[PDB]
Design a protein around this ligand. Sequence first.
Ligand code: CYC
Ligand code: CYC
Ligand code: CYC
Ligand code: CYC
Ligand code: CYC
Ligand code: CYC
Ligand code: CYC
Ligand code: CYC
Ligand code: CYC
Lengths: 54, 173, 160, 92, 160, 160, 160, 98, 161, 161, 161, 97
Amino acid sequence: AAVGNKSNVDAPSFKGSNMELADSGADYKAFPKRRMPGANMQGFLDMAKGMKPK
Amino acid sequence: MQDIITSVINQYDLSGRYLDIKGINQINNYFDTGLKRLMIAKLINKEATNLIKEASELLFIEQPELLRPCGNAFIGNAYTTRRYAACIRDIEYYLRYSAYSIIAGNNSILDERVLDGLKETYNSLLVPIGPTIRVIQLLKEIIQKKFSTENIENAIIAEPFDYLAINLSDKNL
Amino acid sequence: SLVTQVILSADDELRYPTAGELETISSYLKTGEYRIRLISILQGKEQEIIRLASKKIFQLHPEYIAPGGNASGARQRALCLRDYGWYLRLITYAILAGDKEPLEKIGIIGVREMYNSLGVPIIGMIDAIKCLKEATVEVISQEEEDFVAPYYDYIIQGMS
Amino acid sequence: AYDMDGTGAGSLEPRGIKSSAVEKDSRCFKVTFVLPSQSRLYTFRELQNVYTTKMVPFSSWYAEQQRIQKMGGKILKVELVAGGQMRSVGNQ
Amino acid sequence: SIVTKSIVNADAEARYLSPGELDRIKSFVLSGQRRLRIAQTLTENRERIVKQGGQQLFQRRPDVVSPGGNAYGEEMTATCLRDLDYYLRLVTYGIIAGDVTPIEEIGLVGVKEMYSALGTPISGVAEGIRCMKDVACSLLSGEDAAEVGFYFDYTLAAMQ
Amino acid sequence: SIVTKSIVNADAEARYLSPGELDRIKSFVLSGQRRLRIAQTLTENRERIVKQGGQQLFQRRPDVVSPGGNAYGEEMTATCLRDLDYYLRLVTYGIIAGDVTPIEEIGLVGVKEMYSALGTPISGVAEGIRCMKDVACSLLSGEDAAEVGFYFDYTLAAMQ
Amino acid sequence: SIVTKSIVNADAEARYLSPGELDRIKSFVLSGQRRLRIAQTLTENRERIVKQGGQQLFQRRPDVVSPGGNAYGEEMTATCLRDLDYYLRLVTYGIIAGDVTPIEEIGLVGVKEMYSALGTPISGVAEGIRCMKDVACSLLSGEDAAEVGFYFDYTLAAMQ
Amino acid sequence: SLRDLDWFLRYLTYAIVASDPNILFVNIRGLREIIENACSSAATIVALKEMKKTSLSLFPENSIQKEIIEEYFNVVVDEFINPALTDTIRKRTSNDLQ
Amino acid sequence: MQDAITSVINAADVQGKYLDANSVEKLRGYFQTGELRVRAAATIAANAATIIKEAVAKSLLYSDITRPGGNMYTTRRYAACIRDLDYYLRYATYGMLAGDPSILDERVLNGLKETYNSLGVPIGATIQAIQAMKEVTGSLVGSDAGKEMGLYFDYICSGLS
Amino acid sequence: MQDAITSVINAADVQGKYLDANSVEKLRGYFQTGELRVRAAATIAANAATIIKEAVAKSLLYSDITRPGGNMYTTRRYAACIRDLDYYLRYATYGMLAGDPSILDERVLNGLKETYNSLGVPIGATIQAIQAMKEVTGSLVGSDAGKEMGLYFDYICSGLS
Amino acid sequence: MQDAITSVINAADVQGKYLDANSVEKLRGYFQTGELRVRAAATIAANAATIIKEAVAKSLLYSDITRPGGNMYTTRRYAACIRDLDYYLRYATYGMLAGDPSILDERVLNGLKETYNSLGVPIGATIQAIQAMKEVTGSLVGSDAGKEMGLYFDYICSGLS
Amino acid sequence: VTKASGGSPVVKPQLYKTASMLTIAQAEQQDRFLELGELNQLVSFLNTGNIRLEIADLLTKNANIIVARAADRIFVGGSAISYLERPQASIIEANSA
Ligand SMILES: CCC1=C(C)/C(=C/C2=NC(=C\c3[nH]c(/C=C4\NC(=O)[C@H](C)[C@H]4CC)c(C)c3CCC(=O)O)/C(CCC(=O)O)=C2C)NC1=O
Ligand SMILES: CCC1=C(C)/C(=C/C2=NC(=C\c3[nH]c(/C=C4\NC(=O)[C@H](C)[C@H]4CC)c(C)c3CCC(=O)O)/C(CCC(=O)O)=C2C)NC1=O
Ligand SMILES: CCC1=C(C)/C(=C/C2=NC(=C\c3[nH]c(/C=C4\NC(=O)[C@H](C)[C@H]4CC)c(C)c3CCC(=O)O)/C(CCC(=O)O)=C2C)NC1=O
Ligand SMILES: CCC1=C(C)/C(=C/C2=NC(=C\c3[nH]c(/C=C4\NC(=O)[C@H](C)[C@H]4CC)c(C)c3CCC(=O)O)/C(CCC(=O)O)=C2C)NC1=O
Ligand SMILES: CCC1=C(C)/C(=C/C2=NC(=C\c3[nH]c(/C=C4\NC(=O)[C@H](C)[C@H]4CC)c(C)c3CCC(=O)O)/C(CCC(=O)O)=C2C)NC1=O
Ligand SMILES: CCC1=C(C)/C(=C/C2=NC(=C\c3[nH]c(/C=C4\NC(=O)[C@H](C)[C@H]4CC)c(C)c3CCC(=O)O)/C(CCC(=O)O)=C2C)NC1=O
Ligand SMILES: CCC1=C(C)/C(=C/C2=NC(=C\c3[nH]c(/C=C4\NC(=O)[C@H](C)[C@H]4CC)c(C)c3CCC(=O)O)/C(CCC(=O)O)=C2C)NC1=O
Ligand SMILES: CCC1=C(C)/C(=C/C2=NC(=C\c3[nH]c(/C=C4\NC(=O)[C@H](C)[C@H]4CC)c(C)c3CCC(=O)O)/C(CCC(=O)O)=C2C)NC1=O
Ligand SMILES: CCC1=C(C)/C(=C/C2=NC(=C\c3[nH]c(/C=C4\NC(=O)[C@H](C)[C@H]4CC)c(C)c3CCC(=O)O)/C(CCC(=O)O)=C2C)NC1=O
């Protein structure tokens, strides 16, 4: 199914959200995509909750 | 290696002259603190297996990352007990060669037997240099806890541990 | 002993003892009897001291005394004081021959595998010697116990 | 060349084992000895038989016999299997 | 510091240090008692100077913390305050060194390459340091606030 | 055999046998029923495997049997087939031992020294074993011919 | 040559050259006039020494040239004589060097690995060099034939 | 304690996926000694023998898989209650070495 | 500095012979993949900054080389990394187009491991950064194109080791 | 020195996580080809001398490296080749079983191209020998097994280049 | 160093004959006990330290060789024992798997009694330690497996006597 | 400060063995192709294969059940299983069991 029907305008793409299913997530890289804190850093995460909501 | 004495005598041999009184004043400063340099050393032998244990918990209490998985950086911190067993072993050496070097009154034994290739060895195994130097001075504060009421034993204890700190640094300034 | 270390250490270089080493023999032999006078003080306090060692090694570690521990039972505890007696006897040897070899050729070299094949916790034996050194301070004055102090903590360093 | 060039005390190469072996010596002993290691209990290496009987040359018997006693060995028997005695020329 | 670059200045010129250089090394070391007091104030006020520093930073730049901002979520906001703890630390070094030489080769040289390569808005981190400056100078007198603020605005200048 | 060199491997390494070594001694002894059947086929087929073995050997290498060849004459040609009976026997040992260890130290170690010292063309005897291999694998199924032929070609490899 | 290995002999022994070594370098260089005459005879007799060399080689080893032999056809037989031209050349080097050192590290070290890996019967090429030896010694007097033949049989020895 | 009750589930599920139990043996030999002061050791042997009792709920016993993973649990728990190996020493022969 | 065509011409020229069937056989094999390499080098040029940002965050972003004392602490030192990683992703793009890794050791590999030892740069973390950078590059250009671009990454990692 | 299982365990361990579905997914893929690799390593062990004899005769047997002056002239130098080619056919067999080329650069590739330049060994003729050796190896073990054994040959040729 | 299969092949080979019905008759007898020996060698590997701890405590733990003056007083000398008893329990495990005691005299028995006399090690207490070690080994592996493992212990005790 | 440098080659320290692993290394150290005994060594552990692998997933899937049932035994105080923290490296993910 393509549903190409008619009047395929270009401008005004709006907002909202959907988050479609991944794939191909069946491959196999050995490393993750990295993050940051943990150890050495629990102090500041707990502490950026403080301003998170501001 | 070279103690404070032999290092002093090589100082006057290179110039090929006898020992003057400025040379002998340097030797006398060792002979005065020489009796004080021993119970510092004798305290370390009595406090050796302890002083490594307080250093480790004081280290990992600030660096919990060292007891965690490395990340994909294959880095040698104290992840596994095989890693932890050898990693406590390095604290043995830093306390040991910094114990002889307290008695020699000179850091000649330090660099040629500890510093030479230290950044070589740790760069191979990807070992932490930052936390490795911080544990060296956790020992320094821990040892200075015992001799604290006066302050002339403190400069003696600080000299070996301070020398490893300045020398293991990649120089930021 | 100390002269044996100088004869050996000078023998692997195929030379007579140098100027510094002959000091090390001469100074050791001039402090001769004071080790001899000291060991007779400790031999008269072996029943003194091991009774005090069993004070604190077991109030510190009731795991070993309790039913299930290694030292549970009379005959297990019977040799328990014997190991203190041999260690204290060894230290009198080390205090005399002014070095660590009688504490090292006996007692220290291979001690962990001895205890590990016996069931004695090797950490507990470290506290036993540390307990023994804690017990020797009371029956000994301040002059001579720091003479015997470095011979004890070598054993603790040897056992780890 | 041979081990007796003029080396003795106070000479540049370190004072060591000096054998009375000629140029390319062809004398060799048949020795027998036990040599307990006395170092396995802090190294924990594998164990090897210490009772050996082997042919050591005359060029290096003295070093070996000087070393077998270094580590507490006992020499049960040695012989000069190959070579002559009191031979001025011909040990080569 | 002022001591090291007053040397390397006169080092390059093949000469010793003038009175203009040696009456300021002299003037700086007598200033050293007052510098450690100023750095001692910022040392154990990092809890408020950083947390209130990120206070005004998010109120002035909600984009960086909003969804899509670089410091979005519990994770990045913690690192969002981590950098402010870095730059607050370097200002304590510059106050004791009497110069931005510590701040120069740490956190300033090539800083635009890092933050451009991290996707972070470099103007946003400049806004963060300015918010820390008002908190820092509010903790000190007027004679000190002309110094502690003085090192922040240099960091503001080099960070854009 | 696989049992003796899986031992002497782990013997040298100061260790016991791993699961990789003990799950194959296990896997080999359950294979032992099938090995004796395979060796039983070659045992009483030596009349055809050898005689047809020397069949193709002379048709492919008439030089060795022609006048001047090493195996020239009725009472040698007999020894010409004797060696093939040897090597056919060693392959029966290798099949039951599960390895060329019997074939290694018999008929393979230093084989070039013997045949060079006998004047025999070592390449010619290699051709003889290959002719025996086609006769041997023609007597067994495909699952077996991957083994019985498998030991011949090892003998072919070491014999040149 | 005799000059280079009489040096490297005395080189390893940390000494100079004895009269036994220097009265032979002396004796060899006075021999040098006679050596070049001997090598000059074999130099422009390679047409007969090689072609008659392969003459007796095929009459004594028809297998290697027969169909199935390694040197079969117009192609391999040309290379069959090429190797004899090689080894005849190395003998001219050994005669002028006064030693098989040129023949050692060329055409002798690891020669069995090459010819075994080429499928060539190494015994066959040894037969070729022997046939060249009878042609070579037939071209010289008795005093010379004890040399020119002397280097061939060394090549015969190392080639089996 | 939950992190290590985690990990005992882990190198076992690395020893099954690998060939041998060797990775368990390296990381469990001196382990009980190191944590012996902040842990009652018998509070580990109870917890380690609960994983085999739980993991044996999964398979029809006297099938092939039942004997495989059972043998890997008793390699780690019985060797857990086992004295740590002694440090190997490298004493040097002459002065300049260390 | 030779491409696949330069290397084919050199070997065919170094024997003084013409381009026979075997030399042109490889050249035809290179022209077949000519369409794949340009599109591979196309997307890598577009996502150069994005690939390097993905590799460092996936390999060595939070490790203690990033923290104080680690080899990457100061901002000059951090900025040198992404400058340094840009060459590996760039020169690998050149090898992917030229079809020959001669440019890498000519302009990257020689004096490289001898230089990092001078500065004290950890070769271990460097290769894992390139390995992670190789992993993201296979994401963009696809499988076979990632096999091509990946074939020069480990060439850098091998020689840099 | 890691196999496919060692590399899978390392990457799953280096993040401190268990063996999830993706890590076991590749491990199942390796166990499926476990039967193919042993038979591939079986026949290569049998025909080791025959494969090397076929490669040198097909690639560099009669070229002028074989003649005087060429890089392979003397018998010591010729004998070093088949000794040298034996390692490439042997270590490639190890990579084919382990399913990971880590053993090659660990024990073959490092200091290899830097060593041939010292001796003056022609890298061009070396790779073509390995390419010809790869061609005969696909003859014995079949197509897909040749694809597996061939996948480590060009890995040697790539890094050795 | 021969197992039961090696010894059967040797005797059948040393007469130059094939493996007749009598040679295969013993080989079938060895394959029948192949399942028993592995499980016997399995549990002995598990309880190696426990078996040696049981033997010394049951035979020579409190005797006066243990007390000052006997040849097992010092800790080096005590530690040599359990090192020494480990070989007897280990090499006996090898004989139990190989089904032939050739490995014992090859690697244990030769120069053994001649060595203990040199050191002054009491052969009497040694055999009783092995006898007690044989007694506990029959506990673990069962009766018939203990009969097999026990058959090589007294072989050591016989030759060591 | 150290005024010289030997260099730091990349070295991967050993971590463990596997049955697929050491037998590849044993014949490697003897300088030989593995033989049919050792080729029979590498094969039937691969033939173990999916049996080893499925033991992981069945064990990995109910990992919490394996860990929790130990928590009921030797930890007083309610559940006391909240302190688990399965991802131990602080990564966003690549994939999760
Ligand atoms: C006398 C001076 C001297 C030192 C210091 C020294 C260190 C040294 N540390 C080593 C390993 C190691 N060192 C550590 C140490 C650590 N891991 C961390 O995460 C922490 C930062 C740190 C503990 C403070 C680890 C984990 C290894 C093993 C690396 C691995 O195998 O993964 C090794 C390799 C193993 C071996 O010893 O053979 C050496 C040689 N050698 C010397 O001669
Ligand atoms: C000269 C050096 C030297 C020592 C030390 C030595 C020790 C030694 N300790 C032993 C036993 C033992 N040792 C202990 C010891 C203890 N239980 C505790 O709680 C304590 C901490 C510790 C004693 C202070 C126990 C309980 C046993 C009996 C274990 C058993 O057989 O069940 C045994 C077995 C036989 C015997 O008791 O004589 C020896 C040989 N041998 C030596 O040659
Ligand atoms: C440390 C204990 C110890 C000793 C004593 C010892 C002796 C010893 N003396 C030797 C030879 C010798 N010893 C002598 C000695 C003598 N000729 C005479 O007429 C005198 C009676 C005597 C001098 C007092 C001679 C001449 C040789 C050389 C024998 C030869 O070349 O055949 C050799 C043969 C190797 C060599 O010298 O390099 C040894 C090993 N080795 C040891 O380890
Ligand atoms: C001492 C000098 C110095 C600085 C400054 C420094 C910065 C630095 N900032 C980082 C990340 C970061 N920095 C930010 C920062 C921000 N987000 C915002 O919205 C704000 C505008 C801003 C903070 C006020 C974020 C969100 C990350 C994580 C980016 C990512 O995960 O991709 C990282 C990577 C992770 C790490 O290792 O910490 C470094 C190295 N390093 C240094 O050595
Ligand atoms: C078990 C391993 C083993 C082998 C292989 C072996 C071989 C062997 N082959 C021999 C002879 C011989 N072998 C041959 C063989 C051949 N002629 C040809 O043309 C063919 C190429 C080839 C056979 C296929 C000939 C002709 C002789 C006699 C040579 C002579 O009389 O000078 C002899 C000397 C006579 C004897 O004692 O039998 C031995 C020992 N011995 C062993 O123990
Ligand atoms: C200087 C020392 C030296 C030698 C000896 C040498 C030999 C040598 N012999 C060769 C071939 C060959 N050699 C032969 C030789 C023979 N066929 C027979 O039947 C006879 C027994 C024998 C000659 C008397 C044959 C047939 C080939 C070609 C083999 C083939 O095409 O497969 C080749 C390969 C082709 C070539 O490059 O020439 C070399 C390198 N190289 C050297 O550097
Ligand atoms: C994969 C195999 C493996 C394990 C299990 C392992 C454990 C390990 N547990 C540790 C500590 C610890 N482990 C525990 C607790 C426990 N541990 C248990 O096995 C019980 C379930 C529980 C007690 C009931 C505690 C409380 C500490 C902290 C001890 C300390 O403060 O020193 C440490 C020191 C670093 C740290 O603080 O975590 C290691 C290295 N290492 C390994 O390589
Ligand atoms: C296991 C990984 C590994 C490899 C690959 C290796 C190679 C290696 N090849 C060498 C020589 C050599 N290699 C060759 C090879 C060749 N000549 C040619 O024309 C061809 C292109 C090529 C054959 C394919 C030759 C001729 C020599 C001898 C060089 C000389 O004597 O100068 C040498 C010098 C020492 C010796 O052979 O004993 C080493 C160390 N070492 C290793 O550890
Ligand atoms: C694999 C075959 C094999 C054996 C068996 C073997 C034995 C052997 N036992 C030794 C010592 C020893 N063995 C013992 C044993 C004992 N003391 C007793 O009272 C008991 C009766 C007995 C324990 C059962 C002792 C105490 C020593 C040390 C002797 C000494 O230091 O003088 C030594 C001297 C070196 C050393 O231990 O490092 C060897 C070589 N070597 C071998 O290759």
